[PDB]
Amino acid sequence: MLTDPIADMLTRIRNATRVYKESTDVPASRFKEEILRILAREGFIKGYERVDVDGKPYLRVYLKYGPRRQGPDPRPEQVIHHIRRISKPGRRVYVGVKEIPRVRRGLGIAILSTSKGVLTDREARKLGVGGELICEVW
Amino acid sequence: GRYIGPVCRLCRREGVKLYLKGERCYSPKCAMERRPYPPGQHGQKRARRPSDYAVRLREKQKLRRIYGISERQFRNLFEEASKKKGVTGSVFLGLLESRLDNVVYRLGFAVSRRQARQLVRHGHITVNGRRVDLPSYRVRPGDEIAVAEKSRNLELIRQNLEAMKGRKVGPWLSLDVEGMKGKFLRLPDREDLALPVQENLVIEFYSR
């Protein structure tokens, strides 16, 4: 079994980029979707589509990178420089609004899920609600 | 108390022109003229390269030595400054220069940094009317820093207000010379100031 799907997606992504794949299948949840979705908003992937990989639903996640480089090691800059799961099964994590953290004195995100839905920090903040810190992506 | 010793010899220590004694640490005699090198058996001899500390330290001892004050006294207005809003460095200087034993050296009345001291202490000065015999008095902005018509009629006062005919006053003061008064207008500013010192480095010594 999996232990944390989320984790696992994020990782599957951390893993994929780090060697410049084009696009990786993660297997699909509604939640899972909602998260991917935000990466789009903020431009961390190039997006995702639902696919059926032998008859079981997944989520191809078309990652995105910087431009070919100059000098030894022509390897793109990462866009997704950092992705870390925060809440963890059997270590849950909750922020209320005054607590919601500020990611890279401002340059990336936290993803929270709130009773109002999967948001960014600046998203939940404005919207004025707190919740479960999922992850943390610059 | 305060220091009380070879001053135009610290003129010499930091290695930089220090104003403390007046006409003389002024008039080809404060030694940074005659022997710019530092006091003691090892004066001309080359020194090994200041340790990252040393500097940090000197630059403070400088600033202090300058305003004739004790580190105990010194720090307290530091602590104040960092606690206070806005660029710490400045406000230190801000407050330093807000000292009356300075407000008076600034405003001419006596030549020297130590003179405005023993002139305040011995009574001869007033602020707004009331007298103040405390060097450590924190002049705000509004304050008429005066001579006491009581000593007013004195040799050392005439002389030194007479030398102050013609000369100029820091932006943040109005040395009126008729009623021997003198206003203190707004808190001075790093930019407004003279100082032979790297205030940004003084801070750096107290991050210890």
Binding site: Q70, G71, P72, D73, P74, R75 | -
Partner: protein, 237 residues
């Protein structure tokens, strides 16, 4: 200019000793051998030639590299054909990278070269006059193409980027770009402007490389007068 349908000289090389990064440039594997998709080749060729063109007409210089004796000569020739240095015998402990000094060679090549000819040739003992003829003889071997080189070169053109990779590796530490005729046995990544197809096999080294020279000369100041190098294809068969 430019050429089409050169299946009749080249298509692809090397068996299953590949590099998966190359992966994309492969079409399918026939009888365990790999077979490049020239069609992609064509796209790059342009993107690449476009790059030669400009640096040609800028005034600027290519450096050619084959220490491969599988193509040791085509280089010397096609690089003589464009007034452009070549390296041939073996690449060298930092030719570009330590250049300053690999250059102090050419210096004491000239010094020796024209210290022959006539003047004072023999004002010195002889246990030492066939020793110098040796030091020079040697400079002759590998420095010959490295001669016309005076500053750093504004390109590098390689045949086997894997066989010389101490060349490639070098380029980049200095920010110089890399052209190469790289095939499957090699690392696409570290080539800037790539020619997919045969590290090996005269047939194709010729065709390709020589065209590259077509293009250096053409604009710059010359015309298209078939090269004396098709005549060392007929010397393998």
């Amino acid at each position: 200019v430019k050429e089409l349908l050169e299946a009749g000289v080249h298509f692809g090389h090397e068996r299953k000793r590949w590099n998966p990064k190359f992966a994309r440039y492969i079409y399918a594997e026939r009888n365990g051998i790999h077979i490049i998709d020239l069609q992609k080749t064509m796209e790059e060729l342009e993107r690449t030639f476009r790059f030669i063109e400009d640096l040609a007409m800028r005034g600027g210089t290519i450096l050619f590299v084959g220490t491969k004796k599988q193509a040791q000569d085509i280089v010397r020739m096609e690089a003589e054909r464009a007034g452009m240095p070549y390296v041939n015998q073996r690449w060298l402990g930092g030719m570009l990278t330590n250049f300053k000094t690999i250059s102090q060679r050419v210096h004491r090549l000239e010094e020796l070269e024209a210290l022959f000819a006539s003047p004072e040739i023999e004002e010195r003992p002889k246990k030492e006059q066939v020793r110098l003829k040796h030091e020079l003889e040697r400079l002759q071997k590998y420095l010959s193409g490295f001669r016309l080189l005076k500053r750093l070169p504004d390109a590098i053109f390689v045949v086997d980027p894997t066989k010389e990779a101490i060349a490639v590796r070098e380029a980049r530490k200095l920010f110089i770009p890399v052209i190469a005729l790289a095939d499957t046995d090699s690392d696409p990544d570290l080539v800037d402007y790539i020619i997919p197809g045969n590290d090996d096999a005269i047939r194709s080294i010729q065709l390709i490389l020589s065209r590259a020279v077509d293009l250096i000369i053409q604009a710059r100041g010359g015309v298209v007068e078939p090269s004396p190098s098709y005549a060392l294809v007929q010397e393998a068969e």
